Amino acid sequence: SGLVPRGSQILCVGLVVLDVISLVDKYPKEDSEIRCLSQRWQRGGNASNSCTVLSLLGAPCAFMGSMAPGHVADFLVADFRRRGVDVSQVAWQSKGDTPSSCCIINNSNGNRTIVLHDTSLPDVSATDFEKVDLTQFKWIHIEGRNASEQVKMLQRIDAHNTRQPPEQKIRVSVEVEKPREELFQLFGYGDVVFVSKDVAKHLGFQSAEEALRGLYGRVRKGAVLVCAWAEEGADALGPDGKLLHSDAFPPPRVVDTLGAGDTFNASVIFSLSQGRSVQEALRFGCQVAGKKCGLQGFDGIV
Amino acid sequence: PRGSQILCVGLVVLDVISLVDKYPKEDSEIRCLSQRWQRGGNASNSCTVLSLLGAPCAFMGSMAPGHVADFLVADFRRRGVDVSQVAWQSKGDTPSSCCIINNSNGNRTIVLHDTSLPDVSATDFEKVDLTQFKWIHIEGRNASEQVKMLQRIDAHNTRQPPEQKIRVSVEVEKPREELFQLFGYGDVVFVSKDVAKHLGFQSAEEALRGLYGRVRKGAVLVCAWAEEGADALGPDGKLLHSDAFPPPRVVDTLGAGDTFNASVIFSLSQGRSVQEALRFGCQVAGKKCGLQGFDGIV
Ligand SMILES: Nc1ncnc2c1ncn2[C@@H]1O[C@H](COP(=O)(O)OP(=O)(O)O)[C@@H](O)[C@H]1O
Ligand SMILES: Nc1ncnc2c1ncn2[C@@H]1O[C@H](COP(=O)(O)OP(=O)(O)O)[C@@H](O)[C@H]1O
Ligand SMILES: O=P(O)(O)OC[C@@]1(O)O[C@@H](CO)[C@@H](O)[C@@H]1O
């Protein structure tokens, strides 16, 4: 690791996982041995996916998440590095496994059977976050996971910001992606709050407009609540009460939507960190995420 | 060194294992209990077991330079296996697989990534000084090329006294017509339950009586049949059988057949009878079925 200029990086706190994806002509029968058509090892995870996109956009970025020493972590570290992501803030754990998932895709009907990673690895704690010099970062994005601990991390960034002049204040964003009650306390933190379509649907909201009007009461004074909704584009709502919307930019053919939301989050964060408006950031968010949907992986998203 | 090692020729795979409560339904999302990496492959699994049994052993298979091969090599060295005979390849990736182990019954479902890696050729085998080995086990794979390797061991044996002849074994694990030419080679022939079932045989007894005509004069045909144990049949025509040694809880059957093969090979290489080797084969394979991996077999 070397010298990182002050207020230059965008930090994404969250999960990194090794996704082993196998494409099969038919789903295997229990206790059987089949040969896959093609097999890939990928670095997944929301915060991890957003780092890749932030690097491709030309932003210096850093990742913070838990990892255990081993060959799985070595592959993920090398893949982060291949995408120019800074891994100096990784929380190296003595106990637990680096997350790894097995995804079996059936080529005959497109069905995906996923065997998710185990829960052995501890998440990043408030004490792990407390040891980080925050002066390198201009923006800190937190993927909602272990909410009680993340609230303390968010409280530490507020304490830091109270001592800085407006030009050296660290902007903050949070993602509520899974419909879990523990995560809803995170709505009240951050300057930008991303809520997923899946969370909105689980709370009874049938559109991005309903979600934003129904959830704005949970965000802190002055924050912007954002809700992406696939082919219906994305909406945003700020303190002025004006619902903002961007149409989607659907690709010529949809090839791969995995990490589309993470591409949208990184692109909105990037656009706002460059001083652009919320309306311009929604549009850019939809443009990059839309381009990504017509490509396999993140190469060529530009 | 002279006639001290047991050589296993075959595949070496990186097994990415997930241990689950129950096998997933298609299109479902489950959380595994745990995960681990194991050095797999039939011949490679048999080397692990042969080392744990106290046998000096060597592995021969194709590997491509890289981090996957480095992990597997370090594991072969951690398990005391000799890797000096590895056939290093300039193209193709090292094989890997996703193994889903069901903790409730020990079933193992494997999704194998069989790469563009070339197999060990008769030319690669021709460069090996065979004097170090007392036994050579060949996992059936590229049959045309392996028949030439087997023909070379016969030529070598013709020029040696009975005491210094290299004993040979073969495994026919996959139901492929190309592999059935290998029945006519080796002193011991292992045929899998899956192969026997594919040929219409509903038991180890039917398989052995129906397939003995394919083995060479004097050979022993062996057929393991999971919870039903294993059978063997030699030139005397007497069907031998061993009951299984099931653990109260069967938690991992990944590499059980390879444990049985290594244990039968080991017992026979120590001068024990076919009957004693079948029982030991089931004893060790049975103990393995109640443990995750190969630690605690001895
Ligand atoms: N089918 C699609 N066509 C065009 N753009 C899409 C499509 N799916 C996703 N996007 C883009 O990605 C953004 C986030 O998509 P979304 O489906 O809500 O997230 P995710 O699929 O990762 O859960 C959308 O706002 C849109 O800009
Ligand atoms: N369920 C089981 N209970 C007891 N022993 C077993 C069981 N499964 C396998 N074994 C032992 O392993 C040997 C090989 O069995 P096999 O079904 O071919 O395993 P694999 O599925 O790994 O190929 C059997 O002969 C037996 O000794
Ligand atoms: O459980 P089995 O049948 O004894 O064998 C396990 C096995 O060697 O199969 C290989 C694939 O052919 C490896 O993935 C695996 O370790």
Domain boundaries, chain B: 3-298
| Residue A235 near residue A213, CB atoms below 8 Å | no
Element (H, E) at A30: none
Interface with chain A: mutation pick from B26, B115, B289, highest number of A CBs within 10 Å: B26
Residue with tokens 């903002």: A244
Which amino acid appears at position A249 of this protein? F
Domain A7-302 class, CATH top level = alpha beta
Phi and psi for B158 in degrees, rounded to 5? -60, -30
- Please enumerate, as own/partner, the contacts of B199-207 that have beta carbons within 8 Å and a separation of 24 or more: B199/B175, B203/B228, B204/B228, B204/B229, B204/B230, B204/B231, B204/B241, B205/B231, B205/B239, B205/B241, B207/B231
Residue nearest to atom 1 of ligand 1 (CA): A231
Q: A25 to chain B nearest CA, in Å?
A: 11
Chain centroid offset of residue B75 CA: 17
Handedness of CA A297, A293, A299, A284 (dihedral sign): negative
| Closest ligand to residue B261's CA | 2
Distance CA B95, CA A210 (A): 50
Give the pair of three-digit tokens for residue A133: 């010099």
| Residue B178 near residue B143, CB atoms below 8 Å | yes
| Residue B260 near residue B218, CB atoms below 8 Å | no
Give the pair of three-digit tokens for residue A102: 């097995």
**Length in residues, chain B:** 298
Distances (CA, A) of A68 to A21, A99, A244, B153: 21, 9, 42, 47
Burial environment of residue B290 by CB neighbours within 10 A (0 to 12, 13 to 18, 19 or more): middle
Residues of B in contact with A71 (CB under 8 A): 37, 67, 71
Residues of A in contact with B96 (CB under 8 A): 39
Distance CA A216, CA A213 (A): 6
- For residue A79, the SS3 value is helix
Element (H, E) at B198: helix B193-198
* Out of A20, A111, A118, closest to residue B26 by CB: A111
Distance CA A192, CA A195 (A): 10
| Residue A191 near residue A172, CB atoms below 8 Å | yes
Chain centroid offset of residue A11 CA: 11
A104 contacts B111? CB cut-off 8 A: yes
Residues of B in contact with A111 (CB under 8 A): 26-27
B26 contacts A113? CB cut-off 8 A: yes
Nearest CA in chain B to A111: B27
| Residue B259 near residue B285, CB atoms below 8 Å | yes
Distance CA A81, CA A75 (A): 10
Distance CA B29, CA B195 (A): 33
Q: A153 to chain B nearest CA, in Å?
A: 28
B26 contacts A27? CB cut-off 8 A: yes
Ligand 2 mutation target, pool B260, B267, B283, B294, most atoms within 8 A of CB = B260
Q: A250 to chain B nearest CA, in Å?
A: 26
Which amino acid appears at position B135 of this protein? W
| Residue A6 near residue A167, CB atoms below 8 Å | no
| Residue B133 near residue B58, CB atoms below 8 Å | yes
Residue with tokens 């059977």: A113
Nearest CA in chain A to B107: A31
CB pairs < 8 Å spanning A and B: 92
Which amino acid appears at position A238 of this protein? G
For A:82-111, CB contacts with B below 8 A are 97, 100, 102, 104, 106, 111
Distance CA B64, CA A160 (A): 51
A5, A10, A12, A17: CA torsion to nearest 10 = -80
Distance CA A300, CA A136 (A): 29
CA of B275 to the centre of ligand 2 (A): 17
Q: B71 to chain A nearest CA, in Å?
A: 8
Distance CA A264, CA A225 (A): 14
A30 contacts B111? CB cut-off 8 A: no
How was this entry determined? X-ray
Distance CA A12, CA A87 (A): 11
Buried/exposed B34-61: b ≥16 CB within 10 Å, e otherwise: ebebbbbbbbbbbbbbbbbbebbbbbbb
Nearest CA in chain A to B93: A39
Distance CA B145, CA B158 (A): 21
Buried/exposed A57-93: b ≥16 CB within 10 Å, e otherwise: bebbbbbbbbbbeebbbebbbebbeebebbbebbbeb
Phi and psi for B60 in degrees, rounded to 5? -135, 120
Burial environment of residue B88 by CB neighbours within 10 A (0 to 12, 13 to 18, 19 or more): exposed
Distance CA B130, CA B126 (A): 9
For B:122-161, CB contacts with A below 8 A are none
Give the pair of three-digit tokens for residue A157: 């960034």
Residues of B in contact with A77 (CB under 8 A): none
Domain B3-298 class, CATH top level = alpha beta
| Residue B99 near residue B18, CB atoms below 8 Å | yes
List all residues 6 or more positions away from B31 whose beta carbon is below 8 Å from its beta carbon: A115, A116, A117, A118, A119
- Alpha helices by DSSP H, chain A: 46-56, 71-82, 126-130, 147-162, 197-202, 208-215, 260-273, 278-293
A27 interfacial to chain B (CB closer than 8 Å): yes
**Length in residues, chain A:** 302
Give the pair of three-digit tokens for residue A248: 């989607």
The DSSP result for A148-199, as a single string, is HHHHHHHHHHHHHHHTS-GGGPPEEEEEE-S--GGGGGGGGSSSEEEE-HHH
Helices B256-269 and B42-52 sit at what angle, rounded to 10 degrees?
50
B114 contacts A29? CB cut-off 8 A: no
B37 contacts A71? CB cut-off 8 A: yes
A29 contacts B111? CB cut-off 8 A: no
| Residue A39 near residue B113, CB atoms below 8 Å | yes
Q: Is the CB of B43 under 6 A from ligand 3?
A: no
Element (H, E) at B259: helix B256-269
| Residue A247 near residue A286, CB atoms below 8 Å | yes
| Residue B103 near residue B33, CB atoms below 8 Å | yes
| Residue B162 near residue B65, CB atoms below 8 Å | no
Q: B77 to chain A nearest CA, in Å?
A: 17
For A:157-196, CB contacts with B below 8 A are none
